[PDB]
Design a protein around this nucleic acid. Structure first.
Ligand code: SAH
Lengths: 150, 285
DNA sequence: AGAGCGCATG
DNA sequence: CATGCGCTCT
């Protein structure tokens, strides 16, 4: 099946084409404060939903936890049915901007301990349902379940 | 033929167990009452006043999905998260996302774990309470997470104090008009002990701060007694909130301690007003 | 224990 | 404009 993706707080469309997921099927929102459940359902059922905190040293009005909570919210909005029609995965990425308390909250909410991925102190954390380059390897495995347009 | 069963309650941020108190007053038979509290004074009050009926759990953020599944299904889920980082009465508030504010999401979270799975047609009721004096951003965000708009209820209409509060939830008839009862004490005078004269008919919102008892600009003493002005006694304050007399007289607590408990508390007639239609949904004792 | 600060907000 | 599920600091 083709691509169906929901991107939050960051756009991986440029990366989605690079790893071979583009063909219009991607949706991107910056401010999700006024986004309801219907707004998520009406954009068609998504197979994968992505969201990530801005790189630290970037400018953000929002607290580190805001991204997490909004992500979890829209995530619960995006999940399908008790019956499982197709494969559904999710991914949240921390750019080392999350406090110990906040990343503990993240692990509590997403019911999963983060996988930490190093660059080679320029590393990133990730929570994902999966069974830049180094984590691009994490963007990779989706090709087995979803057709690639190479 | 489905019969009515005793009610199963999960109470987050339980305080001095206003929920169980009201439920029992309404004659609603309580199967189990599981409370999440961390303040030892409050937990003591709940433990003593309801004789070990309350099953206590630790921090709310130590409660997991497996716990909800294991602690049976819940008919009712009620909670009021701390508002010291939400209320505009606190200049140094850290907002909904930092400090104690984020605890709201802990309610949110747990609610969805307790919500009966799709294809489950059992009755599920939930109630979330917080203050009106909060920032518009935080209020909107809370409304977005709970996917609902709050209902403002003011205890002024049914008690001897101002208590404008937002209530999110799905209890039947949340928007219905409040109705005074013969048991209700609407004037401060009705709350006082013998030989005491009330300067006021209603008092302003009672916080945990001692001088929230003081009225208006000039910080007037609320009562006058035998050639000497005075503030509210803890018993009088209990009466104002609608609690039974000497409810918080436990654990050798000072005035400030009791008031710290009550200032964070619920207005009993308000919660009774909200839980009132539930006595028709569950077994009566 | 009690007084001051704080200012967005309905 | 009067007001507040509080903190701080004696
Ligand atoms: N992390 C936490 N986990 C569980 N309870 C907490 C908590 N942090 C604070 N609390 C409790 O949550 C309460 C919120 S005040 C609400 C009290 C209650 N609704 C009543 O009617 O009295 C406080 O009393 C506080 O003791």
């Amino acid at each position: 099946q083709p691509v169906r993706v929901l991107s939050l707080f960051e756009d991986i469309k440029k990366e989605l084409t690079s790893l071979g997921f583009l063909e219009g099927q991607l949706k991107h929102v910056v401010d999700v404060t006024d986004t309801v459940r219907k707004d998520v359902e009406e954009w068609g059922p998504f197979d994968l939903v992505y969201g990530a905190t801005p790189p630290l040293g970037h400018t953000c009005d929002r607290p580190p936890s805001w991204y997490l909570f909004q992500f979890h919210r829209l995530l619960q909005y995006a999940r399908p049915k008790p019956g499982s029609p197709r494969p559904f995965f999710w991914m949240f990425v921390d750019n080392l901007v999350l406090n110990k308390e906040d990343l503990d909250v993240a692990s509590r909410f997403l019911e999963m301990e983060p996988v930490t991925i190093p660059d080679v102190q320029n590393a990133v954390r990730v929570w994902s349902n999966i069974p830049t380059k180094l984590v691009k390897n994490c963007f990779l495995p989706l090709r087995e379940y979803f057709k690639y347009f190479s | 033929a489905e019969k009515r069963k005793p009610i199963r309650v999960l109470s987050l941020f339980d305080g001095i167990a206003t929920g169980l108190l009201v439920l029992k007053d309404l004659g609603i038979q309580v199967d189990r009452y599981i409370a999440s509290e961390v303040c030892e004074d409050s937990i003591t009050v709940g433990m003593v006043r309801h004789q070990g009926k309350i099953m206590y759990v630790g921090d709310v953020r130590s409660v997991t999905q497996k716990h909800i599944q294991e602690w049976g299904p819940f008919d009712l889920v009620i909670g009021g998260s701390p508002c010291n980082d939400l209320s505009i009465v606190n200049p140094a508030r850290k907002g909904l996302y930092e400090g104690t504010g984020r605890l709201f999401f802990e309610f949110y979270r747990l609610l969805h774990d307790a919500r009966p799975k799709e294809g489950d047609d059992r009755p599920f009721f939930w109630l979330f309470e917080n203050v009106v004096a909060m920032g518009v951003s935080d209020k909107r965000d809370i409304s977005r997470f709970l996917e609902s708009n709050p209902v403002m209820i003011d205890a002024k209409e049914v008690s001897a104090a101002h208590r404008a509060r937002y209530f999110w939830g799905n209890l039947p008839g949340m928007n219905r008009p409040l109705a005074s009862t013969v048991n209700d004490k609407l004037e401060l005078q009705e709350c006082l002990e013998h030989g005491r004269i009330a300067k006021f008919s209603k008092v302003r919102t009672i916080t945990t701060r001692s001088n929230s008892i003081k009225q208006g600009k000039d910080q007037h003493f609320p009562v006058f007694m035998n050639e000497k002005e005075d503030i509210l006694w803890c018993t009088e304050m209990e009466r104002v909130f609608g609690f039974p007399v000497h409810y918080t007289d436990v654990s050798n607590m000072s005035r400030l301690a009791r008031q710290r408990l009550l200032g964070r508390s619920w207005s009993v007639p308000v919660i009774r007003h909200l839980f009132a239609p539930l006595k028709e949904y569950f077994a009566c004792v």
